[PDB]
Amino acid sequence: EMRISRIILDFLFXRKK
Structure with missing residues (x-):
């Protein structure tokens, strides 16, 4: 469950x- 991290x-x- 991440944000932009995933990006x-x-x-x-x-x-x-």
Whole structure:
């Protein structure tokens, strides 16, 4: 349960993997 973190995460990984 996060915010933009998840978005960083997305920037981190894409949260695609």
